[PDB]
Amino acid sequence: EQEKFLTCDEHRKKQHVFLRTTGRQSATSATSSKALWEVEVVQHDPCRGGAGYWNSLFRFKHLATGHYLAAEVDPDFEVYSLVSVPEGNDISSIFELDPTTLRGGDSLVPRNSYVRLRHLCTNTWVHSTNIPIDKEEEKPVMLKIGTSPLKEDKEAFAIVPVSPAEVRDLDFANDASKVLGSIAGKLEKGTITQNERRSVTKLLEDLVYFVT
Amino acid sequence: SSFLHIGDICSLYAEGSTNGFISTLGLVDDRCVVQPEAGDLNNPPKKFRDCLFKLCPMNRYSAQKQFWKAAKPGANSTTDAVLLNKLHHAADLEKKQNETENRKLLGTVIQYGNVIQLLHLKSNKYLTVNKRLPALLEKNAMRVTLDEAGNEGSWFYIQPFYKLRSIGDSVVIGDKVVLNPVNAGQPLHASS
Amino acid sequence: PYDLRASFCRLMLHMHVDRDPQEQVTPVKYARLWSEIPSEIAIDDYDSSGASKDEIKERFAQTMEFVEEYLRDVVCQRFPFSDKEKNKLTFEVVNLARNLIYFGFYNFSDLLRLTKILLAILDCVPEKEDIMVMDTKLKIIEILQFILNVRLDYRISCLLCIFKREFDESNSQSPGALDFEHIEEQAEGIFGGSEHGGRTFLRVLLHLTMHDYPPLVSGALQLLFRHFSQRQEVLQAFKQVQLLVTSQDVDNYKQIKQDLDQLRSIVEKSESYNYRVVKEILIRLSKLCVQESASVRKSRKQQQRLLRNMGAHAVVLELLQIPYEKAEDTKMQEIMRLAHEFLQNFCAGNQQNQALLHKHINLFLNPGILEAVTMQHIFMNNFQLCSEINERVVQHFVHCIET
Amino acid sequence: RNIIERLQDIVSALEDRLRPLVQAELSVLVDVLHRPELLFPENTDARRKCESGGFICKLIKHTKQLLEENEEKLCIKVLQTLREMMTKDRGYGLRQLEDHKRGEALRQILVNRYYSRGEMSLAEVQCHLDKEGASNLVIDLIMNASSDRVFHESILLAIALLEGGNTTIQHSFFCRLTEDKKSEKFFKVFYDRMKVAQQEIKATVTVNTSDLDDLEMSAVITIMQPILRFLQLLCENHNRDLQNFLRCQNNKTNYNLVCETLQFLDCICGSTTGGLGLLGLYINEKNVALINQTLESLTEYCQGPCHENQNCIATHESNGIDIITALILNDINPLGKKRMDLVLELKNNASKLLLAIMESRHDSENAERILYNMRPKELVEVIKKAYMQGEVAASPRNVGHNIYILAHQLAR
Amino acid sequence: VLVKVKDSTEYTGPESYVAEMIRERNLDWFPRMRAMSLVSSDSEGEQN
Q: Output the CA torsion C73→C78→C83→C89 (10° steps).
A: 10
Compute the distance between CA of residue C27 and CA of residue C152 in angstroms, rounded to an integer: 9
DSSP string, D323-367: HHHHHHHSPPS---HHHHHHHHHHHHHHHHHHHHHSSS---HHHH
Residue C176 burial (C-beta neighbours within 10 Å; 0-12, 13-18, 19+): middle
User: Do the Cβ atoms of C100 and C60 come closer than 8 Å?
Assistant: yes
Nearest to D359 by CA among D296, D400, D300, D399: D300
Q: Which member of A102, A154, A156 has the closest CB to residue B2?
A: A102
Lateral strand order in the sheet of B9-10: B9-10, B53-54, B119-120, B125-128, B145-147
* Subunit partners of chain B (3 or more CB pairs within 8 A): A, C, D
CA distance D283 to C325: 38
Q: Which residue from D24, D39, D59 is facing C229, i.e. has the nearest CB?
A: D24
Give SS3 for C131. Answer: helix
Resolution in A: 3.0
Give the CA distances from residue D38 to residues C230, D47, D109, in Å, rounded to whole numbers and listed in that order: 24, 9, 18
What is the C-alpha to C-alpha distance for residues D348 and D356, in angstroms, rounded to an integer?
Answer: 12
Partners of B76 on chain D (C-beta within 8 Å) are 210-211
What residue ranges do the domains of chain B occupy? 5-192
Coil, strand or helix: which one is C403?
coil
Please count the other Cβ atoms lying within 10 Å of the Cβ belonging to residue D230: 21
- Contacting B with CB below 8 Å, chain C residues are 327, 391, 395, 403
- The CA dihedral of D397, D402, D407, D412, to the nearest 10 degrees, is 130
C97 forms beta bridges with none
- Looking at D87-165, list the stretches that DSSP marks H as alpha helix, in order from N- to C-terminal side: 98-114, 122-131, 134-141, 149-162
Amino acid at C221: L
Question: At residue C361, what is the residue type?
Answer: I
Distance CA A120, CA A96 (A): 7
Tell me how far CA of residue D264 lies from CA of A107, C88, D195, D196, in angstroms. 46, 64, 8, 10
CA-atom Rg of chain C in angstroms: 28
Note whether D242 and D174 are within 8 A (CB): yes
Which DSSP symbol is given to B108? -
B67, amino acid identity:
F
**Closest Cα of chain D to C3: distance in Å?**
32
CB burial readout D100-121, b (16+ within 10 A) else e: eeebeebbebbeeeeeeeeeee
Residues of B in contact with C395 (CB under 8 A): 74-75
Nearest CB neighbour to B164, from listed A100, A102, A103: A100
Ranges of H-type helices in D269-334: 288-302, 307-315, 321-329
Q: Residue A143: name the closest of A11, A17, A7 by CA.
A: A17
Spell D334-365 as b/e; 16+ CB within 10 A means b. Answer: eeeeebeebbbebbbbbbbbbbbbbbebeeee
Task: Specify whether domain B5-192 bears CATH 3.40.50.720.
Answer: no
Q: Which residue of C has its CA nearest to D23?
A: C229
Nearest chain B residue to D210, by CA: B78
CA angle at D86 for the pair D81 and D90, rounded to the nearest 5°: 95
Q: Which among B62, B70, B89 has the least Cβ separation from residue D272?
A: B62
**Chains C and A physically touch (3 or more Cβ atom pairs below 8 Å):** no
- C-alpha distances in angstroms, C106 versus B9, C17, C118, D156? 87, 16, 15, 46
* 3-class SS of residue D184: helix
Cα–Cα distance, B115 to D34 (Å, whole number): 58
Backbone angles phi, psi at A43, to 5 degrees: 55, 15
At position B118, the amino acid (one-letter code) is L
Q: Are D270 and D282 in contact (CB under 8 A)?
A: yes
Q: Do chains E and D touch (3 or more CB pairs under 8 A)?
A: yes
Partner residues linked to B34 by β-bridges: B22
3-state DSSP call for residue E45? helix
* Angstrom distances, CA of residue A149 to CA of A74, A127, B46, D40, E47: 15, 9, 31, 90, 62
Q: Which residues in chain C have their C atom more than 2.5 Å from the N of the next written residue, marking a break after them?
A: 125, 174, 195, 271
- Angle formed by the axes of helices D307-315 and D257-268, to 10°? 40
CA distance D216 to B45: 58
Alpha-carbon distance values, C398 to B48, B141, C98 (Å) = 43, 22, 67
Task: Give the number of other Cβ atoms within 10 Å of residue C382's Cβ.
Answer: 14
B contacts of A156 (beta carbons < 8 Å): 164
Q: Quote the CA–CA distance of D104 and D31 in Å, as a whole number.
A: 13
Closest CA in chain D for residue E14: D304
Under a CB-based contact definition with an 8 Å cutoff, are residues C269 and C211 in contact?
no
> CA dihedral in degrees (B82, B88, B90, B94; nearest 10)?
180
CA–CA gap between residue C334 and residue C336 (Å, rounded):
6
Cα separation, A112 vs A126, whole angstroms: 19
Residue D388 in contact with partner chain C when CB distance is under 8 A: no
The stretches of C271-332 forming alpha helices (DSSP H) are: 275-289, 299-305, 313-319
CA distance D3 to C36: 13
Using CA atoms, how far apart are residues A27 and C74, in angstroms rounded to an integer?
A: 60
Q: Is-contact C248 C34, C-beta < 8 A?
A: yes
Q: How far apart are CA D62 and CA D137, in angstroms?
A: 10
Asked if D73 contacts D91 with a C-beta cutoff of 8 angstroms, the reply is: no
- Residue (of D198, D344, D218, D188) closest to D265 by Cα position: D198
Among chain D residues, the shortest Cα distance to C199 is held by D114
Q: Is-contact C246 C164, C-beta < 8 A?
A: no
Alpha-carbon distance values, B73 to A150, B6, B69, B70, B84 (Å): 61, 38, 8, 7, 12
C-beta neighbour count of C305 within 10 angstroms: 19
DSSP classification of residue C31: S
CB B141 to CB C391 under 8 A? no
Q: How far apart are CA B56 and CA B5, in angstroms?
A: 9
Q: Which of B51, B66, B50 is nearest to B152 (CA)?
A: B66
The residue type at E8: S
Question: Distance between CA D275 and CA D281 in Å, rounded?
Answer: 13
Q: Which of D215, D163, D161, D220 is nearest to D193 (CA)?
A: D220
Q: Does D91 touch chain E (CB under 8 A)?
A: no
Residue of D391, D408, D389, D409 lying closest to D399 (CA atoms) = D389
Please, which experimental method was used?
cryo-EM
CA gap C317, C313 in Å, rounded:
6
Mutation site, B2, B42, B111, B164, interface A, largest A CB count within 10 A: B164
Q: Return the residue in C30, C160, C218, C236 with the most chain D beta carbons within 10 A, the one to mutate for interface testing.
A: C218
Strands A114-119 and A157-158: antiparallel
- Rounded to whole angstroms, the Cα distance separating D27 from D32 reads 9
Residue D300 is labelled as binding a ligand: yes
CA distances, E44 to each of C211, D362, E36 (Å): 73, 20, 21
Range list of H helices, C188-323:
201-209, 216-227, 230-241, 251-262, 275-289, 299-305, 313-319
Exposed / middle / buried, residue D297 (Cβ in 10 Å: 0-12, 13-18, 19+): buried
Are C403 and B133 within 8 A, CB to CB? yes
Q: CA C86, CA C92: separation in Å to the nearest integer?
A: 10
CA distance C200 to C205: 9
How far, in whole angstroms, is CA C319 from its chain's centroid? Answer: 23
Under a CB-based contact definition with an 8 Å cutoff, are residues B96 and D272 in contact? Answer: no
Instruction: Verify whether the Cβ–Cβ distance D277 to B93 is below 8 Å.
Output: no
**CB E13 to CB D237 under 8 A?**
no
Strand partners for B31: B145
Closest Cα in chain B to A153: B175
Q: Give yes or no for a contact between A41 and A49, defined as CB atoms under 8 angstroms apart.
A: yes
Q: Do chains B and A touch (3 or more CB pairs under 8 A)?
A: yes
Which residues, including other chains, have CB under 8 Å from residue C228's CB and lie 6 or more apart?
D24, D25, D28, D29
> Residue C254 — φ and ψ, nearest 5°?
-65, -30
Cβ-based neighbour number of residue A71 at 10 Å? 23
The DSSP annotation for B30-84 comes to -BEEE-STT--SSS--S-GGGG-EE-------SHHHHHHHHSS-SS-----TTTH
Could you tell me which residues come within 8 angstroms of residue D320 by beta carbon, excluding any fewer than 6 positions away? D262, D263, D265, D266, D271, D313
